[PDB]
């Protein structure tokens, strides 16, 4: 059967945050990343 309400919400939501954070580090050149010249 399915996850409970909060666990499903947390799964969906943490993945949004992870994906956004990975995007953010590229856009803001955080953590060692630098755009090519």
């Amino acid at each position: 059967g399915p996850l409970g309400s909060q666990d499903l919400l947390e799964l969906k939501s943490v993945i949004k945050l992870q994906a956004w954070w990975r995007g953010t580090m590229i856009r803001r050149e955080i953590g060692g990343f630098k755009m090519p010249k």
Partner: protein
């Protein structure tokens, strides 16, 4: 998208086209898409890479890149969407999440962050240096131009 916009996608694409042959590769795809405002999940990125690799060649030309950028493109108020996702973890419903709890969930659920990735998140999120994250202010700062 507008001519000006496509020129912007092309400028980004071309920056990662090492020898100017009109292609990038699967190893640059995530970075280029992220640099342009997309936030693919790890699974999504891998599926776009799998699409490119379906013919056993790992290069991507500009029309293919635009096709992948445009496919199921879904506009929203991004800052709000992210604030809402953080709010799910605001257990005491007060606008804050502890740095420890944020580190925990980010590394124990979903597409878990590496230690390097989450270390940076916490370093950026806790700006008062107090073990708490005001996630609305964090997202504001990370969205600023």
């Amino acid at each position: 998208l507008t001519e000006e916009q496509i020129a912007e996608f092309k400028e980004a694409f071309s920056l990662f086209d090492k020898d100017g042959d009109g292609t990038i590769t699967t190893k640059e795809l995530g970075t280029v898409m992220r640099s342009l405002g997309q936030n693919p999940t790890e699974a999504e990125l891998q599926d776009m890479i799998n699409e490119v690799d379906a013919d056993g060649n790992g290069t991507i030309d500009f029309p293919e890149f635009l096709t992948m950028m445009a496919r199921k493109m879904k506009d929203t108020d991004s800052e709000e969407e992210i604030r809402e996702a953080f709010r799910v973890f605001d257990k005491d419903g007060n606008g804050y999440i502890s740095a420890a709890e944020l580190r925990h969930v980010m590394t124990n659920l979903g597409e878990k962050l590496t230690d390097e990735e989450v270390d940076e998140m916490i370093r950026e999120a806790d700006i008062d240096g107090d073990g708490q994250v005001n996630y609305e202010e964090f997202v504001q700062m990370m969205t600023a131009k």
